[PDB]
Design a protein around this ligand. Structure first.
Ligand SMILES: CC(=O)N[C@H](C(=O)NCCCBr)C(C)C
Ligand SMILES: [Cl-]
Length: 130
C-alpha cells in the first residue's frame, strides 16, 4: 500500500541520517569507501563480503533494507571484516579493530536512543508479509 511505502521511505531517511553521522566522524574515515585493490590486492580474496559506508548508502537508495535489523547486519559486517582482516597485535591492526568496533557500537547506540521499537516492529511485519 502507499502507507507501507511511506513507512519504508521513513526507514530510508532514518538510515541515511545514521549513516551520514557515522561517515562524517573522523575516526571512521577508513570505512567510508571500499578498500582499493591497488593498495590491498589480497583484500578481495580474504574478505568475501566487503562492506563500507558508501556501499551502505547505495543499498539504502536501492531499497535493499526493509528493516533496521537488516541494516545492522551490514554495519556488523564492517566490524567483523576488520576483526578478520586485521587480527594482529601490532598498533595498525589494533587501531582499525578499535575504530571498526566503535563504529558498530556508535550505530547501535544511535539506534537505541532514536529508533522507536514500534516503528521497527511495523517494518518487520510488512517485510514478513511480502
Ligand atoms: C578496511 C580495512 O581493513 N583496512 C585495512 C587497514 O588497516 N587500513 C587502515 C588505514 C589506512 Br588507508 C587495510 C590493511 C585493508
Ligand atoms: Cl589516523
Amino acid at each position: 500500500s502507499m502507507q507501507e511505502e511511506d513507512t519504508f521511505r521513513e526507514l530510508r531517511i532514518f538510515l541515511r541520517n545514521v549513516t551520514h553521522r557515522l561517515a562524517i566522524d573522523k575516526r571512521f574515515r577508513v570505512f567510508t569507501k571500499p578498500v582499493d585493490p591497488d593498495e590491498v590486492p589480497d583484500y578481495v580474496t580474504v574478505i568475501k563480503q566487503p562492506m563500507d559506508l558508501s556501499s551502505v548508502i547505495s543499498k539504502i537508495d536501492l531499497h535493499k533494507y526493509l528493516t533496521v535489523k537488516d541494516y545492522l547486519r551490514d554495519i556488523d559486517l564492517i566490524c567483523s571484516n576488520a576483526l578478520e582482516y586485521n587480527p594482529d597485535r601490532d598498533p595498525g591492526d589494533r587501531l582499525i579493530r578499535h575504530r571498526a568496533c566503535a563504529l558498530r557500537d556508535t550505530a547501535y547506540a544511535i539506534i537505541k536512543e532514536e529508533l522507536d521499537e514500534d516503528f521497527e516492529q511495523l517494518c518487520e511485519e510488512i517485510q514478513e508479509s511480502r
